[PDB]
Amino acid sequence: KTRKESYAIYVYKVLKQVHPDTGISSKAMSIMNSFVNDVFERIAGEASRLAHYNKRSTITSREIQTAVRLLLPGELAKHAVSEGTKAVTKYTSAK
Amino acid sequence: RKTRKESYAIYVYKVLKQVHPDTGISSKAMSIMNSFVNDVFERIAGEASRLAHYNKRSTITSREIQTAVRLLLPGELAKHAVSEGTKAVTKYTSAK
Amino acid sequence: KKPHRYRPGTVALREIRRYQKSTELLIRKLPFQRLVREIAQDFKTDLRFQSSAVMALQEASEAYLVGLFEDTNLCAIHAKRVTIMPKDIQLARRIRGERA
Amino acid sequence: KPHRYRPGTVALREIRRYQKSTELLIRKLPFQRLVREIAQDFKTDLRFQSSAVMALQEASEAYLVGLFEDTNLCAIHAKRVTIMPKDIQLARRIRGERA
Amino acid sequence: AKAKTRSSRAGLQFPVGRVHRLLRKGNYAERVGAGAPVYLAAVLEYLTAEILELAGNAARDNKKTRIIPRHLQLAVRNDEELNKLLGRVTIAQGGVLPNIQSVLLPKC
Amino acid sequence: AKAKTRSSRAGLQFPVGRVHRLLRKGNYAERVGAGAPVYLAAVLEYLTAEILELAGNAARDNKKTRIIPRHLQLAVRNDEELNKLLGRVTIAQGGVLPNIQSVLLPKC
Amino acid sequence: KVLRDNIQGITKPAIRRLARRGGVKRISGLIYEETRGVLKVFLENVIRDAVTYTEHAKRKTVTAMDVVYALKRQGRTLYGFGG
Amino acid sequence: KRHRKVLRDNIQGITKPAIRRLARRGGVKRISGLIYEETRGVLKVFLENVIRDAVTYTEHAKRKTVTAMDVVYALKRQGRTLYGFGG
DNA sequence: CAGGATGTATATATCTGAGACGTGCCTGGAGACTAGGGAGTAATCCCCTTGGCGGTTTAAACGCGGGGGACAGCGCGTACGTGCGTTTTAGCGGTGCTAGAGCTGTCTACGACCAATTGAGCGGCCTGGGCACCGGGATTCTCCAGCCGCCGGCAGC
DNA sequence: GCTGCCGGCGGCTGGAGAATCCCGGTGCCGAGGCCGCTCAATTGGTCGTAGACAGCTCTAGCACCGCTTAAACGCACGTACGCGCTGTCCCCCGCGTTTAAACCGCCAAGGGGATTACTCCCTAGTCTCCAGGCACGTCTCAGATATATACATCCTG
């Protein structure tokens, strides 16, 4: 009992979407679980502080956008915003 | 003549007069003291809240603050601070 | 008689003594402000700078350079020399973890 | 008669050999004994999990390798080939750990 | 009826609902918007896909089929942009990048 | 009935109410206890008193009557333990501690 | 003599005074460009974050709190201008 | 005879060839003889710093066992976070 | 300055079998479907403080020129860290063994939340006068270059 | 032997250029009284985290020994170390002079900041059913082993 959450399935799917013929070991999956868990907090804390900085109360895509701009170094962030915008511009079009 | 602000000037000055009853303080030093107090408060509160969530609790109590103090101040400050905090809180609960 | 000229390496120690008690800035304000305004043009055009931020950045960059120079002097003295060279700066920035 | 390599030849081979492997270099039992000896002074009658033991071992491994890298850099700076304690306390003080 | 997952509508492979729950229960803010979990999930997907593709290529270069922490280390340490992001982290069972100073090498 | 401040009952010179309100509005957690503000105020008072005394000694040393940022820097950098506490903070108008390497000095 | 790039505005005696405050005795003839490059790099690495902070708030001025906040992000705090 | 088997002089258990192998992994050519104590000292102090936080975490947790979570936790506190142990 | 012999590396043949990959089950939390009311949003106006301008002036930067001592190079004594053989000693392992500490479930009760009143703590705005600023001038304080008495070799016998 | 003789040697003298102290006049700006308002202190009830007890039980420290492999000891020796001589040319350090920052004042106006009416987006509440975690269950093809050849040294002539 006492089910524990994890990101195993989605990491496996993402691996399959780029390399459909490559497997993964046990530790090599917990490593990516820990990396995702680290990045989640590293972005969310910055976004939360940035929202509090202007005496606001709600988290919107704009502060997350600024957090992405600050954290990811340079060219990588240059890509990310685009997909981020992509990832929302469909969703608002068809809820 | 509006938008009043807040700071720790009065309490710092009051503490100063209880240590050196013949000494003053300039404005820049007072602002530095204010900034240092704010920084230390933010650090300790953040550590205490982090620890409170780390054990999946939902309330911040004196124990969390005490452990956070023990985790930050190196050595002598830690024990002096915990001793004074304990005596102060005992004084508070004893005299409601 | 001959004019009084000091032995080499003494006035340098005099400035070392004098400057280490001073607190004021050692870089002219207008050139630094012009440099900051020029270098901020690339990120966004037609920006305004508050007075306090310029001096804040100034003294921050003063302290950073002072620390870097102190570390470089320590590294140079380690190599049984008395002069500092760019390679000492590069090695210091290697070890502290800034360049790489 | 018997074949003796030029001095410093085996060092180069060990350098390119160990730089490829990934296993630990310190035996587990002495490290566990040292950890247990140290832990007493803080709170006696404790109980240890293994995962903590190899976590500590890995962390110490990484720290020592990182320190040795800077030690080698300081040694090669001084137009030398060996390493001396002075390079070590130079590297530990430039970093600011012992400042 | 006919319930649909938010990830399917957003065209993503990540649990948008899980991220939304984490944001609420993380005490990050008093109130939470709508597109924030979608944006965060997309960013996470992009980063993990990049890392995993690089690791897969590194493993293929070694003539192996699976992925082991050695391949992860060899892929992470070879990208300076990724090196800046993961400068202050270390992975278990990763080894070190083979490098030898030129002075220590023989004369010829 | 007549009202009185919490600090008066706890014998403190720091405001319990303001710190408690900050604990409420600082997003840190959902609920806060009762002894936490008193404890935190006591720690802050201790630290402030120690800093003020250490600065006042140095201020009286150079025959002055009011404290200056230079005096604060001198007091902070001359106590190794407090130096460790404030290891990376830079103080404006603080200068630098006087120190000269032995080698750079003349032969005698 | 008016055409002068602002990077040249950091005069050599200023570098000498900074070095003397550092605690050095002798200086070679090539430090004056390495210092100029390091200064410029460190300047951009802070002004980028500061300017981004200005953009997010829709303002057009780089206030003191912004610059100290961005310095705190980099790991170099500042006392005196508030906080 | 139940517990409290206090040992002494286990720092000497870090043998010389182990340090030689570590240095060879680091990439050095020649090794002096005076580093064998400085390394043993820096490793010891590092262990004290980590174990202090590791122990006080459990002390706050009012338990009697030190898990891996606490070790990784204290390693993250001092900016030495480590992947691969379920963070 | 070109070959031979060597202990290393490289590749390639069999096993071989712990555990990545499905395969089901079932559950609890994520999606579908209801207001509301307060958080942000334009819209407005009213200062204010910042970019900009235009005379002095005066202390700092600059190019020159002179000079001496730190530095990179070269050479030699030398001693200690490396490659290798010979024990032997503690690690690795494999097998049980045991109670201790770790995990989860029930029940109760008390203390933090929230809402409604009331008064005083402090934030603003003058306001007088007192400690730091500044000047010259006397007062010491080290830094240096030459003079002098002494001293230890140095040509002769 | 012993006369000069000569150069250094350190020891001392005193001039010289810098840093320090105090006095005397002058401000600019911390320190305190004032008014009121806005939030913190007083009451009052609730209901649900958190503390206890009361269990179950997975697992970490003890022990036991057989193997064996790497750790400890010694041992020639050459090479990289440390010191010493050395030849400069490149930084140190005053001087004339050339120049731009610093002060000081007067303006315009665009943007920062306080006010206000409102609307529609996310939270508050229920019902529901299907994606994901647990327990297996394997046969994989992933590794693990053993084998066999090219290779780069250090010697030789």
UniProtKB/TrEMBL annotation, chain A:
One of its GO terms (cellular component) is nucleus. One of its GO terms (molecular function) is protein heterodimerization activity. Signal peptide: none annotated. The nucleosome is a histone octamer containing two molecules each of H2A, H2B, H3 and H4 assembled in one H3-H4 heterotetramer and two H2A-H2B heterodimers. The octamer wraps approximately 147 bp of DNA. Residues 1-70 form the Core Histone H2A/H2B/H3 domain. It comes from Xenopus laevis. Keywords: Acetylation, Chromosome, DNA-binding, Isopeptide bond, Nucleosome core, Nucleus, Phosphoprotein, Ubl conjugation. This is Histone H2B. The chain holds residues 32 to 126 of 126 of the full protein. It is found in: Chromosome; Nucleus. The keyword Acetylation applies. Belongs to the histone H2B family. The gene is LOC108704302. The keyword Ubl conjugation applies.
UniProtKB/TrEMBL annotation, chain B:
Residues 1-71 form the Core Histone H2A/H2B/H3 domain. This is Histone H2B. It comes from the Eukaryota. GO terms for molecular function: DNA binding; protein heterodimerization activity; structural constituent of chromatin. GO terms for cellular component: nucleosome; nucleus. It is found in: Chromosome; Nucleus. The keyword Lipid biosynthesis does not apply. Belongs to the histone H2B family. The nucleosome is a histone octamer containing two molecules each of H2A, H2B, H3 and H4 assembled in one H3-H4 heterotetramer and two H2A-H2B heterodimers. The octamer wraps approximately 147 bp of DNA. Keywords: Acetylation, Chromosome, DNA-binding, Isopeptide bond, Nucleosome core, Nucleus, Phosphoprotein, Ubl conjugation. The chain holds residues 31 to 126 of 126 of the full protein.
UniProtKB/TrEMBL annotation, chains E, F:
Coiled coil: none annotated. One of its GO terms (molecular function) is DNA binding. Residues 1-77 form the Core Histone H2A/H2B/H3 domain. GO terms for cellular component: nucleosome; nucleus. Keywords: Acetylation, Chromosome, DNA-binding, Isopeptide bond, Nucleosome core, Nucleus, Phosphoprotein, Ubl conjugation. Residues 80-107 form the Histone H2A C-terminal domain. It is found in: Chromosome; Nucleus. One of its GO terms (biological process) is heterochromatin formation. Belongs to the histone H2A family. The nucleosome is a histone octamer containing two molecules each of H2A, H2B, H3 and H4 assembled in one H3-H4 heterotetramer and two H2A-H2B heterodimers. The octamer wraps approximately 147 bp of DNA. Core component of nucleosome. Nucleosomes wrap and compact DNA into chromatin, limiting DNA accessibility to the cellular machineries which require DNA as a template. Histones thereby play a central role in transcription regulation, DNA repair, DNA replication and chromosomal stability. DNA accessibility is regulated via a complex set of post-translational modifications of histones, also called histone code, and nucleosome remodeling. This is Histone H2A. It comes from Xenopus laevis (African clawed frog).
